[PDB]
């Protein structure tokens, strides 16, 4: 169980002087998604490569999934899985139209639910809970990444979490809680005028999974 964010430990969005669109776009409509697919190739020993066609824009045909280590690559090598995650193009590299991502891989077989499960996200502004909304999934074991994407996306559409220029919120962190043990991700970019999408998305490379029935989600925001 990770301890909660200290004072100062969270990134402040007013100290990011680049355009927030660079963060918005990773949690907007478009994401990588596939059901019951096998890796077709491999570049480095800690990645696997999938043939997944982008239905919406056709920006990609092959997706490189990068993991934190070799043992994660070997577990899911040649096994039929589901893929879900946030992809990037800038500084994405391997070896028709390509894209990169981290983790987001879960076995397909035995992991399917007959009907979608609802997880209730709880949103706090300056310590006070203002609202709740549900996010749906049909997996027994779902990656934290998928649930993060679905929660931020809602927030982007309805709360203007990430806009073109900046955000109405100063800090933000999404907290996941499985029974007793919790962990969190910082929802804001690093300070300065540029935003490294690759480097930010790498936090998902451990492929962390939660149980869809047990897990609790809490987003803590701070206003300006």
């Amino acid at each position, epitope marked *: 169980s990770q301890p909660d964010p200290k004072p100062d430990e969270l990134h402040k969005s007013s100290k990011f*002087t*680049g*355009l927030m*669109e*660079n963060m918005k*776009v990773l949690y*907007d*409509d*478009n994401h990588v998604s596939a059901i019951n697919v096998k890796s077709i190739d491999q570049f480095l020993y800690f990645d696997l490569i999938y043939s997944i066609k982008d239905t*919406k*824009l*056709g*920006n990609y045909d092959n997706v490189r999934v990068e993991f934190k280590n070799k043992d994660l690559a070997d577990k899911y090598k040649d096994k039929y899985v589901d893929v879900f995650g946030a992809n990037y*193009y*800038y500084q994405c590299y391997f070896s028709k*139209r390509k894209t990169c991502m981290y983790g987001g891989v879960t076995e397909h077989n035995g992991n399917q639910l007959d009907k979608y499960r609802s997880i209730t996200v709880r949103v706090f502004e300056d310590g006070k809970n203002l609202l709740s909304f549900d996010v749906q999934t049909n997996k027994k074991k779902v990656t934290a990444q998928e649930l993060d994407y679905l929660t931020r996306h809602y927030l982007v559409k309805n709360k203007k979490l990430y*806009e*073109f*220029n900046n955000s109405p919120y100063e800090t933000g962190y999404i907290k996941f809680i499985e029974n007793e043990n919790s962990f969190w991700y910082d929802m804001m970019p690093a300070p300065g*005028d*540029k935003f490294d999408q690759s480097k930010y998305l790498m936090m998902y490379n451990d492929n962390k999974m939660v149980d869809s029935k047990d897990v609790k989600i809490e987003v803590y925001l701070t206003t300006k």
Partner: antibody
Amino acid sequence: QIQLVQSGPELKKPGETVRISCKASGYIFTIAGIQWVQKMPGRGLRWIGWINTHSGVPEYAEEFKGRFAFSLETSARTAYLQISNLKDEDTATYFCARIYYGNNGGVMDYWGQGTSVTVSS
Amino acid sequence: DIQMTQSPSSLSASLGERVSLTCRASQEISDYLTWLQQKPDGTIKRLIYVASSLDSGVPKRFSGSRSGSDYSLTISSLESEDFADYYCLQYANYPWTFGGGTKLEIRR
């Protein structure tokens, strides 16, 4: 290097649809979106909206919603604008412009040469 | 919606005159401002970006500055090709909106 080239003039009729293209070259297309602007004869510039080439999410000005639509073909590095129920007031020049938000110096940095649409029966 | 009042709408000048277009925001816009030029030709190019920075391959004589909610474009010494239209534009929030434009014509 970086250049946006638009398609030629169009002479359409009232009620017909038209499709103006804006082909970009000299950069990886997914790094920057494309905006559209209307120039009417003898009057100022008017913002139609833009579209993010990663993600695909469009943003339109209220007065152009419902009849003006943004579309893409990314493998061709090409942005389309489509206008539906053509009207006399749609007669104007249309310009595309690069929205490279990855750098603070890239908003509307490179412009297209413009496309003329004339609506008459 | 952010209204961008651009003044004056017509300006009369001569060769070598220092001139100054002002453009005011009805709401806080914080340096998200850009100046554009449209020639009689029709062609449009960006002049100034982030309110005060000169666009690459636009001559020194062009500059831009801020004074609160008051934004301005300055041309230190007019050449012939400069007698064109000039528009400011805010992209601080949606919809992005254009100033009414200034037309720069020659005195006689």
